Structures are given as C-alpha cells and as structure tokens.
C-alpha cells in the first residue's frame, strides 16, 4: 500500500458512513427507538461558542462552523444523545458532496473513545475496518502526516471513556500541533475540564428550538398525530417548552405506539418514565451500592430532591465527606453539572425543573410509607406551602406531583386545600380584568363598590388547580365531599373571547359538584353566536 | 537528522508555546481558575536585580532584561504562580516576532524541574515532544553545542523539585560554562540558597502595581463590575493595597461567579478562603502528621499566629529542636521565608499581614472551644 491509493480509501471512508447504523437511531443496544432514522430526524445543531469567562459568545451551526473551524474542539453540550450520529452524518455531508470546508479534509475518520484495543490504531480497524494491511502504526502516523490538514477525526465517547486504553488518546488532541490534522473532541460536560486546556475551538450545544424539534416528532408520527401533540403541549407552557430538547420529545415519542393522541396527563408522569430510563441506563453503572440500590442514593438525597422544589432551586452542592458520592447522580445524569469555578451540582440534563416529579415522588414515598409518622412528615412538607398561590413558584405544581405519585393519599392533600384561608394571592389580579372594563357591570349592580371579588379574587383560580388535581390521582367520586366543600362560597367568571377548553374536564366524573360554586359568569361579545357555551350546561 | 533541519525544529518550538496550555491559566489540575487566559492577563513583570548584600539594586522588566540578560539566573520572587506561564509567553514573544534579544537564541526550550524521566533529555521529549528520533543524548549535547549561545532554557519547578531524577539538573546551570547556552533558573525563595553560587544573573520579583493588577481583574469581570470592585478596595487602605500581588486579586476574583458586586465584607474573610486553598494545595503535601492534621501544626503554633498580631511582628524563628518542623508552614506557604544571613521565618507569601485573620481565628478557636477557661 502507498499514498497514491488514498484516493481509493477515501472513497471507502465515504461509504463507511454510508450505512444505516450511522443513519438509524439510537444505534444499539436500544434502538429504543430514541426517535427515528437519523436522516429524517437530522437538522443543523444549535451551538454557541464560549469565552474563557464561562459564558456564550456567538451562535454557530455546523454549516457556519465549516470554515470557522479550529482544532482541538472543546465543544460541549448537555448530556443525552448529544453529538449523536449527526456529526457522523456531517462527515456523511463530506461524502454527500457537501460544502468545500467538509472537503477541506481528504480523509475523515470517526473515532471511538468508548471502545479501544491494541494496537490502538487498529481500534479504527476494529471499528471503521477500512484499514489497509501494509500500513503498520508508525507507517500509519507517517502516512497521516504526509498531508498535515487533510484528515478530520470525530472522537466518540467522553464519559464512556475509562482508564483502560487511555494512552494515545490525548495525543490526537494535545499532540495535535504535531499530528497536523484537525479533530472534533467529544465531550460530556461533567468531564470537560479534563481538556479545557487543549482545544483551540469550543462551543456549547444550545437547546434546540421547540418548533424545530417537532421535525423530530414528525418522523414516526402521522402528521395529524403530530398536530394532536401540538395541541397537547398547549396544555401548559411548561409542557410547551419541553420540546426545547430532543430528549423530552423522545419521552413523549415512546408513548405513541399504542395511541393516536395522548397525554400523561401530568407533565411529571411523562417525566417519570424518563427517570426509570435513567435507572435502566445505569444498572450496569451502579458504581457502588448493591444491585440497583445506587438508586437508593437519589432517595438518600430524596429530601434534597424534595428541596429542589422546596429550596427554590434545583441546584445543590454535594455533601462534604463520604456523601460526596451523591454526585453519583451527575454520573447518572439525574443531576448533570456545568463545569465552572466554585462549581456545584444541578439536576439539568437539559431543564433542571425536570426533577420536580421526584420531589413530588419523595412526598409520595413518604405518604405510601410503612407508617403514619413518615406520612405526617410528608404532611409537614405541606406546612411549607400556602394555597394555590404558589402556582408562581416550585410548590404550586408540587401538589400535582404529589398526586400523580399517589392515590388515596391525596385526600390528605385535599385536607390542606381546606386549610387554605389565604384565598391564594391578590397581587396582580383585579375583579375588573375579566370583563375588561373600567365601568359598572351587572355584577357592579349587585354591589355598592367598584370592586369586591378582588378580595377573594382567586376563588376560581383555585378551581383550575382543582380540575387538574381531580384529574391527577384520577380521583373519581372518592375525593368529591372535599371538592364540594373546596369550591364552596365561590364564583367563576369566563369571557367568551377567552374561553378555556379545560372547563368540560372537571365534568369527567363529577359534573354535578359544579353546584358547589355559586355563579358561573359569562361575557359574550361581537356576536350572539354561544353554542360552545351551552354545551357545558 | 542533522543540524540543517534546526531551522525546521526551531519553527516547531515556536508552536510548542503556541497552545492554550501555555496561554490559559492556572494550567491544571485546577484550572481554579486562578485568573484568566494568560494573554489577556499578561503584563511586564516587576523585578529587581539584587546585590550580594541581600538588597535590591535596580528595577528591571523582562523587556529591559532582554539584552542585559546573563546566565544562570538566580532570579527569584515570592511564592505563588510566580514565573507562571508568563516566561513561557516570553518565549512566545521570541515566537511572536519579539525584540532581537529574544531571537538571540536560535532555539528555546521550556524545562520542567517538576517532572523528569530517563533518559533525562527525553523529559523534554516527554514534555516538549518535538525531539527528533536520530538524536541520541550525546548527539543532543553535541548538537546543542554546535551553536554555543543559540539556545535558552526556562527551568520550571523549584520547590516541586525532589531528590529523584536530581542529576544533570545542576549541569545546565553549574556546567553552563561548558554547556554554552543561556538559561533562566526557576526559584521559589525558600530554596534559592541551593544555587546562590551558580547564577551570573539574579533578580527579585517586586510586588506588582495595584493599578496594573487590575488588568488582571478585567479579564473575567465586566468592566463596570471591575469598577464596583474599584470602589470596594476603597473600603480600606489595607484592602486597597491587596492588589499589589496577583494572588489577592485571585482571592477576590474567585467570588464574582455568583455576584455583580461583592465584599467579604471583612478584609480577613477574603483572606480565609485563601488559607483553606493553602490547605487544599498541601493535602498531598502533609509531610508528616496524620491525614490533614499537618494543618494542626499551624494550630500548634496558633498562639504564635496569635503572636503575629500580638508580638507586633509577623516574623518568627522556628523553635530549637523537633518543633523546627513548624517551618512546615514555609513549605506550606503560610509562612514563606526570605533567604538571608541569620534568617528567621515570616508569614509573607507576599504581604505578611495576611496572617492577621488566623490570629483572630485562633482567638475564635479559643472562644468556640470545648470549655469556658
């Protein structure tokens, strides 16, 4: 073998990536499927070059990274599928007649950090396999340098990386100043600070657009099925923004196999399947503890998980001493962390608020616990919270998370709903916002002042929370004495312009308890045309 | 390989220092970060040539040291980051088209006192790596001497230095009269008196300007955030003068990650984080005692620490006999010391008054103690 046949092998490299393994997704052993084949799913990656200060500098895509590219890459992004096979397909773009700067490299080699075998270059032979027989390893380094810029390499497997087979791994990156080819260096972020001093390039995979991520959903789902989901993330803004990352999309994509349209219905119950998947991934990765009981460590920090909703932040610092092993969860990805000076853990794998269900779950673990005192301890976590009020913050939704978690026990939840005397909060709300008027109404004829509902303005605010709560433990006729009493002494007022779809929702098992409320008030503008209103009555 | 390709390797040397590792700071394992990337942070070093009497003679910077340079260097400065990567970047200046006296050397090799491996020249191969395969070690010495002045070497790691791999280390410096190349010899100061008889040059890193040191602060902080800090050292003159050294700056730089403007508020509480960092550095360096309880030795001399505020001086002489091990703190840097005739310890690592919190702390250790007495 000589270099004149590098116009042969190069073509072969172009067919190394010309296979479904590169193009079908999650490539084994599941193959869950994460999403779909990579080509229908593939899009330009949101990434942001960063400064040494530890903040983003500019917005790049690979398409605009092509000529601006430097080596080594310290380019990073939040854990999941990440670089996926999409960079592999970027190579495939070099082999699909792509832009000139993809052909700025005569040879491109996918590299696997995750698996290695002596002789170490033969890892690629044990992977890429197109390695000719004449080329010894020295010969292979000499050969590669015959060109000095005409080869690119993608490193695949940064956390997967281990101490075994560790040498001549940093040689591509640190000894790149004498290896002369460019290279994209894989990173997870927990790990990055192991090469924060090697790479001449660096970028942060920004969260993908929700809209763009729907291009993911589209590949398996029917297009109307996708529109049904598009109605489904309208349920809540927290649901609507889940599509920022492809992983949340995967979380709802795994559910379509039995259904034409679905919900969880809780944004948290969606979230729980993902947690179990997390357990699934790490079983081989128990890294201490017995069997699966490394899981127990998240429970060990369960009252911490409790604190993420509770300490107004999902960010923690692992305990000084032997408990620092709690950051096992960073290893697990329950709590992945951002490298930074005076760094402390967070749950974001993408979206730290994702951990809200577990906090609700811990409460459930307390409620379903072997004894009443642990349950009351769970209850004492309700001595922490004041009415619906807290819809503005992490404990608002928390009772929801408590309920998706447990059945009969949410009657205890309903007990605190009776312990509500605050009426929520009156700030930012006004009995003169529903009609949209600064002038006397029919409701005004009922009273001597301009206002009064304002005092107890959130009497129906309670009801929206309530229909969701009723829905969450699927609480049927069991929780009804409570809800007849909970919305009592209160009135609901709707504008025709802003008619929610969720009002016929309560009417699942208990439409009759509607008569706990006093008056349901309706404002009808523009035209007398209300068929949609009556349907309720 | 022959010498005609020394116009090849030289270029490669110029790209040895053309990497972020040379330019990004504190280069591992933390990477704290001490300050920032070296290039925005880099400035001309306050240094002072000294006499044999043990006092400063003139004010030099490297820029004015370039033609006045001699070898070996006994050039020294107070412990911390010190020579940092800034001399490395001085080489990078030789490789950035810098002044003629930086090119007065056809080849420049960064040298590591801190790590060494046989064959000993291959340390550089195990470090610089641009070492061609034909060149045996004899061949490499013969080669280096083909020129006799056309190579400079920076030695990196004077306290880090140990007995293992000790030979042909002094050969670059003492046998420099027959090695013919120039060389800058790294020093910490505790140690310097181990080569106070080898170097034809000698200088003392003077404390940096407070104002100049703000050029440090600037690299991570927003510029108004820096102005906020500029109001903050006005709090007190003791706070205002902390900026003399880059380390105090690092002490307040580590705090901006959560805040737009901050104080400790005490000038001492700032100082305590630095002490803990000192503990952090020396854990591998317990050098006796159990676990971290070498720390206990500063406490053992705690009533001494008490005395620094109390005996009107931060300077002490370690106790005669087995307690001389107290000067462990010089090894730790809590008490680094100036070499001098009839020498006795001080806390300055830069600014001995820095030890004032510990004296207050010892009192606290007394107040929070197990008993009223």
PDB file of N, CA and C in Angstrom, chain A residues 305 307-309 311-316 335 345-348 351-356 359 394:
ATOM      1  N   UNK A 305     -34.076  16.221  46.928  1.00  0.00           N
ATOM      2  CA  UNK A 305     -34.867  16.206  45.704  1.00  0.00           C
ATOM      3  C   UNK A 305     -36.101  16.994  46.120  1.00  0.00           C
ATOM      4  N   UNK A 307     -36.138  19.173  48.449  1.00  0.00           N
ATOM      5  CA  UNK A 307     -35.615  20.545  48.437  1.00  0.00           C
ATOM      6  C   UNK A 307     -35.483  21.181  47.058  1.00  0.00           C
ATOM      7  N   UNK A 308     -35.276  20.440  45.971  1.00  0.00           N
ATOM      8  CA  UNK A 308     -35.199  21.174  44.717  1.00  0.00           C
ATOM      9  C   UNK A 308     -36.497  21.943  44.523  1.00  0.00           C
ATOM     10  N   UNK A 309     -37.664  21.321  44.662  1.00  0.00           N
ATOM     11  CA  UNK A 309     -38.893  22.103  44.540  1.00  0.00           C
ATOM     12  C   UNK A 309     -38.866  23.095  45.717  1.00  0.00           C
ATOM     13  N   UNK A 311     -36.197  24.185  48.005  1.00  0.00           N
ATOM     14  CA  UNK A 311     -35.242  25.279  48.247  1.00  0.00           C
ATOM     15  C   UNK A 311     -35.178  26.301  47.108  1.00  0.00           C
ATOM     16  N   UNK A 312     -36.311  26.481  46.432  1.00  0.00           N
ATOM     17  CA  UNK A 312     -36.446  27.388  45.275  1.00  0.00           C
ATOM     18  C   UNK A 312     -35.446  27.186  44.157  1.00  0.00           C
ATOM     19  N   UNK A 313     -34.617  26.159  44.266  1.00  0.00           N
ATOM     20  CA  UNK A 313     -33.599  25.904  43.273  1.00  0.00           C
ATOM     21  C   UNK A 313     -33.387  24.420  43.078  1.00  0.00           C
ATOM     22  N   UNK A 314     -33.070  24.028  41.856  1.00  0.00           N
ATOM     23  CA  UNK A 314     -32.703  22.653  41.606  1.00  0.00           C
ATOM     24  C   UNK A 314     -31.208  22.500  41.753  1.00  0.00           C
ATOM     25  N   UNK A 315     -30.522  23.517  42.283  1.00  0.00           N
ATOM     26  CA  UNK A 315     -29.088  23.333  42.387  1.00  0.00           C
ATOM     27  C   UNK A 315     -28.601  23.046  43.812  1.00  0.00           C
ATOM     28  N   UNK A 316     -27.724  22.055  43.923  1.00  0.00           N
ATOM     29  CA  UNK A 316     -27.165  21.599  45.196  1.00  0.00           C
ATOM     30  C   UNK A 316     -25.643  21.492  45.204  1.00  0.00           C
ATOM     31  N   UNK A 335     -28.658  14.527  37.949  1.00  0.00           N
ATOM     32  CA  UNK A 335     -28.066  15.799  38.306  1.00  0.00           C
ATOM     33  C   UNK A 335     -26.833  16.165  37.464  1.00  0.00           C
ATOM     34  N   UNK A 345     -23.321  21.136  41.693  1.00  0.00           N
ATOM     35  CA  UNK A 345     -24.293  20.286  41.017  1.00  0.00           C
ATOM     36  C   UNK A 345     -25.645  20.958  40.766  1.00  0.00           C
ATOM     37  N   UNK A 346     -26.387  20.438  39.789  1.00  0.00           N
ATOM     38  CA  UNK A 346     -27.734  20.901  39.439  1.00  0.00           C
ATOM     39  C   UNK A 346     -28.361  19.658  38.850  1.00  0.00           C
ATOM     40  N   UNK A 347     -29.685  19.598  38.737  1.00  0.00           N
ATOM     41  CA  UNK A 347     -30.306  18.487  38.011  1.00  0.00           C
ATOM     42  C   UNK A 347     -30.418  18.569  36.500  1.00  0.00           C
ATOM     43  N   UNK A 348     -30.166  19.735  35.911  1.00  0.00           N
ATOM     44  CA  UNK A 348     -30.403  19.883  34.483  1.00  0.00           C
ATOM     45  C   UNK A 348     -29.603  18.812  33.743  1.00  0.00           C
ATOM     46  N   UNK A 351     -32.800  21.356  31.256  1.00  0.00           N
ATOM     47  CA  UNK A 351     -34.022  21.623  32.038  1.00  0.00           C
ATOM     48  C   UNK A 351     -34.011  21.005  33.441  1.00  0.00           C
ATOM     49  N   UNK A 352     -33.455  21.704  34.431  1.00  0.00           N
ATOM     50  CA  UNK A 352     -33.403  21.171  35.799  1.00  0.00           C
ATOM     51  C   UNK A 352     -34.773  20.999  36.464  1.00  0.00           C
ATOM     52  N   UNK A 353     -35.755  21.761  35.992  1.00  0.00           N
ATOM     53  CA  UNK A 353     -37.109  21.656  36.525  1.00  0.00           C
ATOM     54  C   UNK A 353     -37.691  20.267  36.315  1.00  0.00           C
ATOM     55  N   UNK A 354     -36.992  19.476  35.520  1.00  0.00           N
ATOM     56  CA  UNK A 354     -37.409  18.131  35.213  1.00  0.00           C
ATOM     57  C   UNK A 354     -37.525  17.302  36.491  1.00  0.00           C
ATOM     58  N   UNK A 355     -36.638  17.594  37.442  1.00  0.00           N
ATOM     59  CA  UNK A 355     -36.652  16.976  38.776  1.00  0.00           C
ATOM     60  C   UNK A 355     -37.860  17.251  39.702  1.00  0.00           C
ATOM     61  N   UNK A 356     -38.816  18.041  39.240  1.00  0.00           N
ATOM     62  CA  UNK A 356     -39.996  18.342  40.060  1.00  0.00           C
ATOM     63  C   UNK A 356     -40.861  17.145  40.472  1.00  0.00           C
ATOM     64  N   UNK A 359     -39.434  15.272  43.459  1.00  0.00           N
ATOM     65  CA  UNK A 359     -39.731  15.924  44.729  1.00  0.00           C
ATOM     66  C   UNK A 359     -41.150  15.592  45.162  1.00  0.00           C
ATOM     67  N   UNK A 394     -42.146  26.940  42.577  1.00  0.00           N
ATOM     68  CA  UNK A 394     -41.999  25.494  42.572  1.00  0.00           C
ATOM     69  C   UNK A 394     -42.975  24.699  43.437  1.00  0.00           C
TER      70      UNK A 394
END
